[model samples]
Target: GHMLEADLVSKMLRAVLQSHKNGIVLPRLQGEYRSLTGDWIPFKQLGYPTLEAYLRSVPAVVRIEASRSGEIVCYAVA
Candidate 1:
Protein backbone atom coordinates (compact mmCIF):
# COMPACT_ATOMS: atom_id res chain seq x y z
CA GLY A 1 0.00 0.00 0.00
CA HIS A 2 0.98 3.64 -0.42
CA MET A 3 -0.05 7.04 0.83
CA LEU A 4 -0.29 10.53 -0.51
CA GLU A 5 1.63 13.41 1.03
CA ALA A 6 -1.09 15.16 3.03
CA ASP A 7 0.98 18.27 3.58
CA LEU A 8 1.37 18.87 -0.12
CA VAL A 9 -2.24 17.96 -0.79
CA SER A 10 -3.49 19.94 2.20
CA LYS A 11 -1.43 22.96 1.29
CA MET A 12 -2.70 22.89 -2.27
CA LEU A 13 -6.27 22.17 -1.20
CA ARG A 14 -6.12 25.02 1.28
CA ALA A 15 -5.06 27.32 -1.47
CA VAL A 16 -7.81 25.92 -3.67
CA LEU A 17 -10.51 26.32 -1.01
CA GLN A 18 -9.44 29.87 -0.31
CA SER A 19 -9.56 30.57 -3.99
CA HIS A 20 -12.98 28.95 -4.15
CA LYS A 21 -14.19 31.17 -1.33
CA ASN A 22 -12.85 34.14 -3.20
CA GLY A 23 -15.04 33.17 -6.16
CA ILE A 24 -12.40 31.46 -8.26
CA VAL A 25 -13.72 28.55 -10.30
CA LEU A 26 -12.61 25.11 -9.19
CA PRO A 27 -14.48 21.93 -9.99
CA ARG A 28 -15.20 20.50 -6.57
CA LEU A 29 -12.91 17.56 -6.01
CA GLN A 30 -15.50 15.28 -4.45
CA GLY A 31 -17.82 17.49 -2.46
CA GLU A 32 -20.05 20.52 -2.85
CA TYR A 33 -19.75 24.26 -2.64
CA ARG A 34 -22.17 27.11 -2.94
CA SER A 35 -22.40 29.12 -6.09
CA LEU A 36 -22.82 32.89 -6.23
CA THR A 37 -26.43 32.52 -7.23
CA GLY A 38 -27.10 30.56 -4.02
CA ASP A 39 -27.16 27.22 -5.74
CA TRP A 40 -24.86 24.43 -4.66
CA ILE A 41 -22.73 23.15 -7.48
CA PRO A 42 -21.11 19.77 -7.35
CA PHE A 43 -17.69 19.61 -8.95
CA LYS A 44 -19.00 16.82 -11.12
CA GLN A 45 -20.98 19.43 -12.97
CA LEU A 46 -17.75 20.73 -14.46
CA GLY A 47 -15.08 18.12 -14.22
CA TYR A 48 -11.91 18.77 -16.20
CA PRO A 49 -10.98 15.32 -17.43
CA THR A 50 -7.28 15.99 -17.38
CA LEU A 51 -4.95 17.22 -14.66
CA GLU A 52 -3.22 19.54 -17.12
CA ALA A 53 -6.60 20.85 -18.18
CA TYR A 54 -7.56 21.42 -14.57
CA LEU A 55 -4.38 23.40 -14.03
CA ARG A 56 -5.20 25.51 -17.02
CA SER A 57 -8.72 26.04 -15.78
CA VAL A 58 -8.03 27.34 -12.29
CA PRO A 59 -6.92 30.97 -12.01
CA ALA A 60 -4.67 30.29 -9.03
CA VAL A 61 -0.99 31.14 -9.34
CA VAL A 62 0.18 27.73 -8.19
CA ARG A 63 1.31 25.36 -10.93
CA ILE A 64 3.74 22.51 -11.55
CA GLU A 65 6.56 21.76 -13.92
CA ALA A 66 8.83 18.77 -14.45
CA SER A 67 11.84 19.21 -16.65
CA ARG A 68 14.64 17.19 -15.06
CA SER A 69 14.41 13.54 -14.17
CA GLY A 70 13.62 14.26 -10.52
CA GLU A 71 11.91 17.34 -9.19
CA ILE A 72 8.98 19.49 -10.19
CA VAL A 73 7.89 22.60 -8.36
CA CYS A 74 5.44 25.46 -8.53
CA TYR A 75 6.24 29.16 -8.10
CA ALA A 76 4.79 32.57 -8.78
CA VAL A 77 6.73 35.83 -9.07
CA ALA A 78 5.49 38.87 -7.27
Candidate 2:
Protein backbone atom coordinates (compact mmCIF):
# COMPACT_ATOMS: atom_id res chain seq x y z
CA GLY A 1 0.00 0.00 0.00
CA HIS A 2 1.00 3.59 -0.57
CA MET A 3 0.44 6.63 1.53
CA LEU A 4 0.48 10.38 1.23
CA GLU A 5 2.88 11.12 4.00
CA ALA A 6 1.28 13.49 6.44
CA ASP A 7 4.39 15.48 7.25
CA LEU A 8 5.47 15.84 3.65
CA VAL A 9 1.96 16.74 2.58
CA SER A 10 1.70 19.35 5.30
CA LYS A 11 5.05 20.87 4.42
CA MET A 12 4.41 20.98 0.70
CA LEU A 13 0.85 22.23 1.17
CA ARG A 14 2.16 25.00 3.36
CA ALA A 15 4.56 25.94 0.62
CA VAL A 16 1.72 26.22 -1.86
CA LEU A 17 -0.44 28.20 0.53
CA GLN A 18 2.42 30.52 1.31
CA SER A 19 2.83 31.51 -2.32
CA HIS A 20 -0.68 31.00 -3.61
CA LYS A 21 -3.26 33.62 -4.47
CA ASN A 22 -7.02 33.82 -3.90
CA GLY A 23 -7.85 31.66 -6.88
CA ILE A 24 -6.17 28.45 -8.08
CA VAL A 25 -6.62 26.31 -11.13
CA LEU A 26 -5.53 22.70 -11.62
CA PRO A 27 -2.43 23.58 -13.64
CA ARG A 28 -1.29 26.20 -11.18
CA LEU A 29 -1.88 23.89 -8.27
CA GLN A 30 0.03 21.09 -9.95
CA GLY A 31 2.92 23.39 -10.69
CA GLU A 32 2.99 24.62 -7.12
CA TYR A 33 2.99 21.06 -5.78
CA ARG A 34 5.70 19.97 -8.18
CA SER A 35 7.88 22.98 -7.50
CA LEU A 36 7.62 22.53 -3.76
CA THR A 37 8.11 18.77 -3.90
CA GLY A 38 11.13 19.06 -6.17
CA ASP A 39 9.18 17.67 -9.13
CA TRP A 40 9.42 14.21 -7.73
CA ILE A 41 6.09 12.58 -6.88
CA PRO A 42 2.89 13.96 -8.35
CA PHE A 43 -0.58 13.29 -6.96
CA LYS A 44 -1.25 10.75 -9.69
CA GLN A 45 1.96 8.96 -8.81
CA LEU A 46 0.66 8.65 -5.30
CA GLY A 47 -2.59 7.07 -6.57
CA TYR A 48 -4.66 10.16 -5.98
CA PRO A 49 -7.67 10.59 -8.26
CA THR A 50 -6.86 14.30 -8.65
CA LEU A 51 -5.02 17.09 -6.98
CA GLU A 52 -8.31 18.21 -5.50
CA ALA A 53 -8.53 15.01 -3.49
CA TYR A 54 -5.23 15.75 -1.88
CA LEU A 55 -6.19 19.33 -1.18
CA ARG A 56 -9.67 18.51 0.01
CA SER A 57 -8.44 15.80 2.31
CA VAL A 58 -6.83 18.39 4.51
CA PRO A 59 -9.68 20.68 5.34
CA ALA A 60 -7.88 22.06 8.34
CA VAL A 61 -5.56 23.99 6.07
CA VAL A 62 -7.64 24.58 2.97
CA ARG A 63 -10.97 26.01 1.95
CA ILE A 64 -11.81 24.37 -1.38
CA GLU A 65 -14.62 25.63 -3.57
CA ALA A 66 -16.04 23.72 -6.48
CA SER A 67 -17.63 24.96 -9.65
CA ARG A 68 -20.95 23.77 -11.03
CA SER A 69 -19.02 21.47 -13.33
CA GLY A 70 -17.65 19.59 -10.33
CA GLU A 71 -14.26 21.15 -10.82
CA ILE A 72 -12.27 22.97 -8.24
CA VAL A 73 -12.59 26.66 -8.95
CA CYS A 74 -10.45 28.09 -6.21
CA TYR A 75 -9.02 27.58 -2.74
CA ALA A 76 -7.88 29.56 0.25
CA VAL A 77 -6.04 28.83 3.43
CA ALA A 78 -8.18 28.18 6.46
Candidate 3:
Protein backbone atom coordinates (compact mmCIF):
# COMPACT_ATOMS: atom_id res chain seq x y z
CA GLY A 1 0.00 0.00 0.00
CA HIS A 2 1.08 3.57 -0.63
CA MET A 3 1.81 5.91 2.28
CA LEU A 4 -0.86 8.48 2.87
CA GLU A 5 -0.39 12.25 2.39
CA ALA A 6 -0.17 12.76 6.15
CA ASP A 7 2.73 10.33 6.21
CA LEU A 8 4.65 12.25 3.55
CA VAL A 9 4.04 15.52 5.35
CA SER A 10 5.92 14.03 8.26
CA LYS A 11 9.08 13.74 6.19
CA MET A 12 9.04 17.37 5.00
CA LEU A 13 8.25 18.61 8.50
CA ARG A 14 11.15 16.69 10.04
CA ALA A 15 13.56 18.11 7.49
CA VAL A 16 12.43 21.64 8.31
CA LEU A 17 12.90 21.12 12.05
CA GLN A 18 16.19 19.29 11.58
CA SER A 19 17.50 22.26 9.60
CA HIS A 20 17.32 24.25 12.84
CA LYS A 21 19.00 21.68 15.09
CA ASN A 22 22.19 23.74 15.45
CA GLY A 23 20.34 26.71 16.95
CA ILE A 24 21.08 27.61 20.60
CA VAL A 25 17.46 27.82 21.66
CA LEU A 26 15.62 24.51 22.05
CA PRO A 27 13.04 25.08 24.75
CA ARG A 28 11.66 28.16 23.04
CA LEU A 29 11.07 26.14 19.89
CA GLN A 30 9.45 23.36 21.85
CA GLY A 31 7.20 25.94 23.46
CA GLU A 32 6.11 27.08 20.02
CA TYR A 33 5.01 23.53 19.18
CA ARG A 34 3.23 23.13 22.48
CA SER A 35 1.38 26.37 21.95
CA LEU A 36 -0.13 24.92 18.81
CA THR A 37 -1.93 21.90 20.26
CA GLY A 38 -0.02 20.88 23.43
CA ASP A 39 2.52 18.54 21.73
CA TRP A 40 5.19 18.61 19.11
CA ILE A 41 4.67 16.60 15.92
CA PRO A 42 7.13 13.84 15.16
CA PHE A 43 9.43 14.37 12.16
CA LYS A 44 8.03 11.28 10.46
CA GLN A 45 4.64 13.02 10.41
CA LEU A 46 5.22 16.29 8.54
CA GLY A 47 4.68 17.63 4.97
CA TYR A 48 1.53 17.40 2.88
CA PRO A 49 0.48 14.13 1.23
CA THR A 50 1.89 15.30 -2.13
CA LEU A 51 4.39 18.05 -2.90
CA GLU A 52 1.70 20.11 -4.59
CA ALA A 53 -0.60 19.67 -1.62
CA TYR A 54 2.13 20.66 0.80
CA LEU A 55 2.98 23.77 -1.19
CA ARG A 56 -0.67 24.75 -1.34
CA SER A 57 -1.01 24.50 2.42
CA VAL A 58 1.72 27.08 2.91
CA PRO A 59 0.39 30.38 1.54
CA ALA A 60 3.78 31.92 0.72
CA VAL A 61 7.28 30.86 -0.12
CA VAL A 62 10.26 32.51 1.57
CA ARG A 63 12.42 34.48 -0.84
CA ILE A 64 15.60 36.51 -1.06
CA GLU A 65 16.05 39.68 -3.14
CA ALA A 66 19.29 40.66 -4.84
CA SER A 67 21.06 43.58 -3.17
CA ARG A 68 22.57 45.12 -6.32
CA SER A 69 19.75 44.56 -8.76
CA GLY A 70 16.07 43.60 -8.65
CA GLU A 71 16.30 39.82 -8.94
CA ILE A 72 14.24 37.38 -6.95
CA VAL A 73 15.43 34.06 -5.60
CA CYS A 74 12.96 31.38 -4.61
CA TYR A 75 12.70 27.59 -4.55
CA ALA A 76 10.01 26.01 -6.66
CA VAL A 77 9.04 22.70 -8.17
CA ALA A 78 10.82 21.52 -11.31
Ordering by lDDT: 2, 1, 3
Quickly count the clashes in candidate 2. Answer: 0
- Better model by lDDT, 2 or 3? 2
lDDT of the structure predicted as candidate 2: 0.66
Per-residue lDDT of candidate 1, residues 1-78 (tens digit): 533443334345445455544332333432322232223332233575653344444435444453365333333211
Worst 10 residues of 1 by lDDT: 29-38
Global lDDT scores for all candidate models: 0.38, 0.66, 0.37
Clashing residue pairs in candidate 2 (N, C-alpha, C atoms within 3 angstroms): none
Q: What is the TM-score (0 to 1) of candidate 2? A: 0.64
Highest-lDDT candidate: 2
* Model 3 global lDDT (CA atoms, 0 to 1): 0.37
Error of 1 at 57 (Å): 1.7
CA lDDT of 4 in candidate 1? Answer: 46
